[PDB]
Amino acid sequence: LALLTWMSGRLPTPATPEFWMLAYFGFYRKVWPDAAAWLQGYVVPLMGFA
Amino acid sequence: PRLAAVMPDAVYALVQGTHKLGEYAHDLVFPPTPEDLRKLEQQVNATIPREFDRVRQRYAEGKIANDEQLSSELEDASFNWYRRQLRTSVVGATDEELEDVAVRKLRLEPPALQASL
Amino acid sequence: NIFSKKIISKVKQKKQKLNYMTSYLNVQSEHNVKIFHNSWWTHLNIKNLVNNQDSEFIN
Amino acid sequence: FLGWLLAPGRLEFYEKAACVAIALRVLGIVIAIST
Amino acid sequence: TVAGLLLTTTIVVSLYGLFAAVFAPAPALPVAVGAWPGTAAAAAVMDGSAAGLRRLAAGGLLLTAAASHGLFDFAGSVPNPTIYSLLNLGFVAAAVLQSYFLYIAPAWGVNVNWDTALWGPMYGTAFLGLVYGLVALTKFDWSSVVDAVLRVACWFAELTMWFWDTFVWKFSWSEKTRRA
Amino acid sequence: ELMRSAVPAPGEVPNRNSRGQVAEQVRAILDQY
Amino acid sequence: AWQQSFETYGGKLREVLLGQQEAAKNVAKQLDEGVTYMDWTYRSTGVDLSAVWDPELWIRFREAVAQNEPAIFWNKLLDRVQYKENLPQAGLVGDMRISYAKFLELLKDQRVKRLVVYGDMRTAVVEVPHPWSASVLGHPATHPFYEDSAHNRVSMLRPNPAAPEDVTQWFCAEMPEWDMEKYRFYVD
Amino acid sequence: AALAASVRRIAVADPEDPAGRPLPGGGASGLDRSRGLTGAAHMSGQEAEELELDWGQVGRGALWRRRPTRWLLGGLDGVKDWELEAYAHEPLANQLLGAKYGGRDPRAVVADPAYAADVLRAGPLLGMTFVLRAARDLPLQEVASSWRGLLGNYLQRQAPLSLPKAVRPAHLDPTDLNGVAWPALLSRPAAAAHAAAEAEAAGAVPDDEMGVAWRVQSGKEAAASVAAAQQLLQSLPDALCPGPSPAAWPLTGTKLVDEGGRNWRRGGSVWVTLQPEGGVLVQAQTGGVVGEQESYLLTHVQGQEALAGAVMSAFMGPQPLDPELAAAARSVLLVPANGFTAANKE
Ligand SMILES: CC[C@H](CC[C@@H](C)[C@H]1CC[C@H]2[C@@H]3CC=C4C[C@@H](O)CC[C@]4(C)[C@H]3CC[C@]12C)C(C)C
């Protein structure tokens, strides 16, 4: 995000395709398959269903 | 000027300053010992060679110097210790003849293990 | 504690001279930067002499 | 990299450049206080 | 805002606790093979003194579920915007008190980790009630946590710009200069 | 002599000087004064 | 003002440290072992710093700051920058190559004192003592390092009771490595 | 001693005179291969069998300051006091309990409380061991008051002890100070059944199949021993904490506790064993590098049947500290009664 705003000269918001490309590729395929296990093992026990 | 001389002085000053700051960091957190300073006193005293004890007594009884006469007194003590160590290197010590010098520099004898315990 | 500092500095320099002089037994010297005819062999491009003139399995 | 960076020739160039630099700095301030 | 999310999540969790508590007869306690084959209540069945207990817990969970649904679809305009301040008390304090009970539960040595349909929604709804006390305590605008996101994003951006210009490539080199 | 190490010590290795170093020594002592 | 902060926080930190004194000396070992080998940096940051980090230089710096002898540090660092000056220039004179078979033969019969395999592992500098500087025989070609009172060099022969009548099969002690005159041969 | 302290193994020249060629003896010695390790000593099976380590592990449990909750975040609320394991003599476990409760349905054997009173009263006969290790930082005053409150209720709420009858005197033979008679006791005429029967004719005839003539002591000897046990426990704040100076405390000066004199180190282990006749054995061991582990013998009291019964019926009794390890240990004490051995060293 920092480098994209510096280069293109504007921040990627959900109105732009850059934000969605970053979101999908980066977030969903690099951090989500692990942060999912993290939340499934740390925050969901607090709520009702285990 | 002469970077070849500046760099070693630079690194020496760096590490020595770090040592000083560490000593300060250790004397405030862990305050100094009141009497084991005498332990270190005497245990840095004990390794002073004999050729210097002649001025140590001269340091006790008043007639040390003004500030300059000692700084030319201990010089000859340093030098006679120097030549004595040179003779111990070449011709050996006082209780040691050439056969024992050849023994010592050939590393022929082991350190006594039975006498250790 | 000044007298000890002075006499031990004296014997320290003396031990340094003992090491740099002859067979002293426990002391570590210090080395110097060498600024002179440094290595003398990179001054030369001798490939044409050694390979006797007078990369296809790669790509 | 450092053995190439601190070669004697580069050392002498650094030294001469720094000498002329400090010289011109102090000379400029000398002529500037002289105004 | 996070008030709506809070209450609707308490809705979902309590209704699922009901749908899993009123549809099954009972779970079974592990036998712990070889545990004092005589007395000490081991290698037995659960009693008719706890099924009604489970149904009472489920009924209380349903009443607080419907209460949360009422408050949620009432204060969705956040008709009375300020009357619920009374039931606010009832909706939060007891909840926290609830947790207190469960917070003393390991002290009493009661086991809550083995069974599913009893203490799960217990701790869930209790912590969610404390969190609603939070939502009313610091009043998340639903755009303030987004502001914290933006704050940490700006800080990390200023970190990576420095890292770039110091260890990768100078910003004076990468960017084009003009006038000549 | 059975339990001696055969690896002498980091210390008991005496110094030995190369040619350039004996030249350095001879200069620094000939013009000691 | 900084000394005012030191004198203020020192008494507080001293008591807090002396309180536990059990984790405050294993946190020390964890921190020092983590700073020596920077082997934590990949999963922490994404930059595997262990490949450009030098443990030995750091350990030498720690020792030179703890015993206040900068040589222990400097003497090391200097031969890192000045590594081309330390290639052997004494026992190598001209075309001082040996052959792979000659080197193998010298190796099998125990005439090689020190083998120095280099970085690429495809080049070596064999070190072979002069034949008279190998054993402690009192040959009048070795410098008189070790002498008797009556100034006669010492020798350490033993006549091999199993195979006498042949001097080359006798037993004798070996000379300290720092007293040998050595050829330094090259080999691919 | 200097030779033994180091590791250097030296081959032996052949007594055959020709060449003095060292023999292929060598040896890996899996007890030697295991130094430098931390937890235990991997042993390649049979080697541990030929070492007579006849105490197979039976159950693992944990003393929790507060057991962990599934619901709160990650179960960090779980704080464990100690990590305890138990062991019991396997040959004797096959000998006594295997001759009576063996040959039936395992579930049916464990299902009746006769087996429960069996494993309760015949425990101290097996020389059962409990090895509980420190899992965190422990100040001695804290865990000491904890232990007092822990063994008070087990001291109060227990009945007279059930003890066997001593058939043979087992006098010592001072001139033979490492000879033991149990091989002769099993192989006296090669028909030791009849001689053993006419020998127990004097003392008593056994009460059941395995061969024990039980004798639960009467009204008296059931409170005097309990009073002496309460006294021995009354010496805990005095023996553990004598006076205000740690410099004279027995814990200072060795790595089982910190140098500060008021905390016990993690990895510290306590071993408990119970002889038949009310005798207690207790040892300690600071863990870590197997190459320098320090074992310590604490005390050896005798006749204290009350504390022996308290320990056995507290670890495995009707209301133990954790019924899970009690159940597991009873079932795994059943499993070798069929003949085999857990940690199968055959
Ligand atoms: C409920 C305690 C449980 C483990 C069992 C330990 C704490 C018990 C078993 C044997 C006992 C000692 C027998 C004789 C001695 C010697 C005497 O001087 C003072 C009393 C003392 C220590 C006795 C008291 C402490 C000892 C060790 C733990 C795990 C909860």
Instruction: Give chain B as a 3 state SS string.
Output: CCHHHHHHHHHHHHHHHHHHHHHHHHHHHCCCCCCHHHHHHHHHHCCCCHHHHHHHHHHHCCCCCCCCCHHHCHHHHHHHHHHHHHHHHHCCCCCCCHHHHHHHHCCCCCCCCCCCC
- CA B76/CA B85 separation, integer angstroms: 14
Enumerate neighbours of E (3 or more CB pairs within 8 A): A, H
Q: Are G and B neighbours with ≥3 CB pairs closer than 8 A?
A: yes
Residue where the block lists tokens 């560490």 = B22
Best probe of the E interface among H70, H77, H105, H330, by most E CBs < 10 A, is H70
Structure tokens at G10: 């020192």
In order, the DSSP letters of C1-59 are --HHHHHHHHHHHHHHHHHHHS--SS---------SS-SSSTT---HHHHTT----S--
Please enumerate in sequence order all residues whose Cβ is within 8 A of that of H287, keeping only pairs 6 or more positions apart, or say none: H38, H39, H133, H267, H268, H269, H293
- CA A27/CA A33 separation, integer angstroms: 9
Q: Which letter does DSSP use for residue H269 in this model?
A: E
Amino acid in the structure at residue F20:
G
Amino acid in the structure at residue H258:
D
Beta-carbon contacts below 8 Å between A and E:
35
- Hey, are the CB atoms on F15 and C23 less than 8 Å from each other? yes
Alpha helices in G24-157 (DSSP H): 26-36, 41-45, 55-66, 70-81, 100-108
Residue A6 has its nearest CB partner, among E14, E122, E161, at E161
- CA H299/CA H233 separation, integer angstroms: 13
Q: With contact defined as beta carbons under 8 Å apart, do H211 and H96 qualify?
A: yes
* Contact status of C15 with chain F (Cβ, < 8 Å): no
Single out the residue of H277, H278, H273 nearest to residue H307, CA to CA: H278
- CA E90/CA E157 separation, integer angstroms: 45
Q: With contact defined as beta carbons under 8 Å apart, do H65 and H173 qualify?
A: no
Residue G78 has its nearest CB partner, among C28, C31, C39, at C31
- CA H193/CA D2 separation, integer angstroms: 90
Which residues does a gap of C–N over 2.5 Å follow in chain G? none
Vertex H273 angle, CA H203 and H293, to 5°: 150
For the Cβ of H145 lying below 6 angstroms from any atom of ligand 1, the answer is no
Shortest distance, CA F27 to any CA of chain H (angstroms):
51
- Hey, are the CB atoms on B82 and C14 less than 8 Å from each other? yes
Take atom 22 of ligand 1 and give the residue whose Cα is closest: H236
Structure tokens at E61: 């969970």
* Contact status of H4 with chain F (Cβ, < 8 Å): no
Q: With contact defined as beta carbons under 8 Å apart, do A19 and A13 qualify?
A: yes
Q: Which H helix or E strand runs over H55? A: strand H55-66
- CA C20/CA F26 separation, integer angstroms: 11
For the Cβ of H159 lying below 6 angstroms from any atom of ligand 1, the answer is no
- CA H243/CA H248 separation, integer angstroms: 8
- Ligand 1 centroid–CA H301 distance in Å is 11
Query: What is the arrangement of strands in the sheet containing G114-117, beginning at the earlier edge strand?
Result: G114-117, G124-129, G182-187
- Hey, are the CB atoms on H74 and A42 less than 8 Å from each other? yes
Structure tokens at H218: 């009467």
Give H70's contacts in chain A (Cβ within 8 Å): 45, 50
Please enumerate in sequence order all residues whose Cβ is within 8 A of that of G96, keeping only pairs 6 or more positions apart, or say none: G183, G184, G185, G186
- Is H304 strand, coil or helix? coil
Q: What is the resolution of this structure in A?
A: 2.8
- CA G38/CA G31 separation, integer angstroms: 10
Best probe of the G interface among H136, H252, H258, H262, by most G CBs < 10 A, is H258
Structure tokens at E77: 């305009």
Take atom 4 of ligand 1 and give the residue whose Cα is closest: H311
Q: Give the chain D residue whose CA is nearest to the CA of C33.
A: D8
Single out the residue of D4, F24, C39 nearest to residue G89, CA to CA: C39
Q: Are G and A neighbours with ≥3 CB pairs closer than 8 A?
A: no
Vertex E51 angle, CA E46 and E57, to 5°: 130
Q: With contact defined as beta carbons under 8 Å apart, do B33 and G91 qualify?
A: no
Amino acid in the structure at residue G136:
V
Q: With contact defined as beta carbons under 8 Å apart, do H127 and H89 qualify?
A: yes
Q: With contact defined as beta carbons under 8 Å apart, do H331 and H46 qualify?
A: no
For the Cβ of H234 lying below 6 angstroms from any atom of ligand 1, the answer is no
For the Cβ of H97 lying below 6 angstroms from any atom of ligand 1, the answer is no
Alpha helices in chain H (DSSP H): 2-5, 46-49, 90-95, 97-100, 106-111, 113-121, 140-156, 182-186, 192-203, 224-234, 236-240, 305-315, 323-334
Structure tokens at A29: 């395929």
Q: Are F and A neighbours with ≥3 CB pairs closer than 8 A?
A: no
- CA H267/CA H38 separation, integer angstroms: 10
Shortest distance, CA B31 to any CA of chain D (angstroms):
43
- Is E179 strand, coil or helix? coil
The number of the ligand 1 atom at minimal distance from the alpha carbon of H299 is 16
Q: How many alpha carbons lie under 13 Å from residue G131 in its C-beta half-sphere? A: 2
- CA H341/CA H346 separation, integer angstroms: 8
Please give the distance of CA B13 from its chain centroid, rounded to a whole number.
22
Q: Which residues pair with G128 in a beta bridge?
A: G183
Q: Give the chain G residue whose CA is nearest to the CA of D4.
A: G81
- CA E155/CA G81 separation, integer angstroms: 38
Residue B19 has its nearest CB partner, among G68, G77, G147, at G68
* Contact status of C44 with chain B (Cβ, < 8 Å): no
- Number of other CB atoms surrounding residue G175 within 10 Å: 20
Amino acid in the structure at residue B109:
E
- CA E96/CA E132 separation, integer angstroms: 10
* Contact status of C50 with chain G (Cβ, < 8 Å): no
For the Cβ of H228 lying below 6 angstroms from any atom of ligand 1, the answer is no
Q: With contact defined as beta carbons under 8 Å apart, do H257 and G22 qualify?
A: no
- Ligand 1 centroid–CA H143 distance in Å is 12
Take atom 26 of ligand 1 and give the residue whose Cα is closest: H233
For the Cβ of H270 lying below 6 angstroms from any atom of ligand 1, the answer is no
- Number of other CB atoms surrounding residue G187 within 10 Å: 17
Shortest distance, CA E100 to any CA of chain A (angstroms):
15
Take atom 8 of ligand 1 and give the residue whose Cα is closest: H311
- CA H157/CA H310 separation, integer angstroms: 9
Helix axes B3-29, G2-20, angle to 10 degrees: 60
The b/e string for G88-98 (b: 16+ C-beta within 10 A; e otherwise) is eeeeeeeeeeb
- CA H225/CA H155 separation, integer angstroms: 10
- CA G18/CA F15 separation, integer angstroms: 46
Q: Are H and E neighbours with ≥3 CB pairs closer than 8 A?
A: yes
Q: How far lies E26's CA from each of E23, E48, G148, in Å?
A: 9, 10, 101
Mutate to test the pocket of ligand 1, among H158, H282, H312 (most ligand atoms within 8 A of CB): H282
Residue where the block lists tokens 């040996």 = G98
Q: Give the chain G residue whose CA is nearest to the CA of H262.
A: G20
For the Cβ of H147 lying below 6 angstroms from any atom of ligand 1, the answer is yes
- CA E110/CA E104 separation, integer angstroms: 9
Sort G78 into a burial class: Cβ within 10 Å, 0-12 / 13-18 / 19+: buried
- Ligand 1 centroid–CA H145 distance in Å is 12
- CA E33/CA H111 separation, integer angstroms: 9
Beta-carbon contacts below 8 Å between D and G:
7
For the Cβ of H150 lying below 6 angstroms from any atom of ligand 1, the answer is yes
For the Cβ of H132 lying below 6 angstroms from any atom of ligand 1, the answer is yes
- Ligand 1 centroid–CA H148 distance in Å is 9
Single out the residue of H316, H235, H228, H231 nearest to residue H272, CA to CA: H316
Please give the distance of CA G182 from its chain centroid, rounded to a whole number.
18
Single out the residue of H156, H330, H115, B78 nearest to residue E35, CA to CA: H330
Residue where the block lists tokens 């303030």 = E144
- Ligand 1 centroid–CA H233 distance in Å is 7
Give E156's contacts in chain A (Cβ within 8 Å): 2
Q: Give the chain B residue whose CA is nearest to the CA of F13.
A: B105
In order, the DSSP letters of H128-151 are -EEEEEE-S-B-HHHHHHHHHHHH
3-state secondary structure H230-289: HHHHHCHHHHHCCCCCHHHCCCCCCCCECCCCCCECCCEEEEEEECCCCCEEEEEEECCC
- CA B49/CA C3 separation, integer angstroms: 14
Take atom 27 of ligand 1 and give the residue whose Cα is closest: H282
* Contact status of D2 with chain G (Cβ, < 8 Å): yes
Shortest distance, CA E140 to any CA of chain A (angstroms):
20
- CA G71/CA G69 separation, integer angstroms: 5
Q: How many helices (H) and strands (E) does chain E have?
A: 7, 0
Q: How far lies H94's CA from each of A32, B61, H329, H339, in Å?
A: 55, 88, 15, 6
- CA G100/CA G105 separation, integer angstroms: 9
Alpha helices in H166-322 (DSSP H): 182-186, 192-203, 224-234, 236-240, 305-315
- Number of other CB atoms surrounding residue H185 within 10 Å: 15
- Number of other CB atoms surrounding residue A44 within 10 Å: 13
